[PDB]
């Protein structure tokens, strides 16, 4: 029994491995904000930016020049905001150059047609900005309001 097959077309340079496209990776990649069926841009970008802004307040808050200082969480928030702004500028200029239709693979047989235009990628960039700012500020608020929150004591004792 060949569990590693092609995608239906063998001469295309890809293989349908269990990791690539079997049953659980076709879903949860087609159900991510990118490649989900019903979402518009400025909603895909909102979800992606919220997740990214939330995760990126982890190596700036406890890993920085100010991490031994009470200004450390605020400096990590400002650094996350700056990185999200730089990434939004990158997304905006990537769209402003001109985008093509995204690459269709075995995992994603249907790519979002709304991201194939410059106007869709501008909405994605704006949603990424608002989401990144919101996620970074939400992670800052969650890390700052108990003022110790000993989950942050974990992975800062590691990153001493």
């Amino acid at each position: 029994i060949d569990v590693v097959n092609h995608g239906g077309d063998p001469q295309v340079g890809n293989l349908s491995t269990p990791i690539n496209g079997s049953a659980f990776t076709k879903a949860f990649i087609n159900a991510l904000p990118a490649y989900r069926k019903g979402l518009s841009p400025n909603r895909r970008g909102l979800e992606v930016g919220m997740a990214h802004g939330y995760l990126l307040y982890g190596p700036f808050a406890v890993l920085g020049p100010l991490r031994l200082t009470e200004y450390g969480p605020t400096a990590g928030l400002l650094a996350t905001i700056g990185l999200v702004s730089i990434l939004t500028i990158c997304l905006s200029i990537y769209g402003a150059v001109g985008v093509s239709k995204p690459t269709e693979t075995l995992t994603t047989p249907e790519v979002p047609m709304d991201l194939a235009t410059k106007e869709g990628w501008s909405e994605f960039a704006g949603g990424f900005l608002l989401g990144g700012c919101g996620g970074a500020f939400f992670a800052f608020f969650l890390c700052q309001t108990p003022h110790l929150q000993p989950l942050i004591e974990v992975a800062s004792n590691i990153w001493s």
């Binding site: 730089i86 500028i89 200029i93 402003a96 150059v97 001109g98």
Partner: protein, 38 residues
């Protein structure tokens, strides 16, 4: 650390401008220049 020279606050503004702000502006503008079609 501010210096004893006159207008010591100008390194605190120009150095992040010339080291972070305008290189980002120049790379964005040159990226749009070298990647635009026609």
């Amino acid at each position: 650390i501010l210096g004893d020279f006159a207008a010591s606050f100008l390194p605190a503004i120009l150095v992040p401008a010339v080291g972070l702000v305008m290189p980002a502006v120049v790379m964005g503008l040159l990226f749009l220049q070298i990647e635009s079609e026609a």
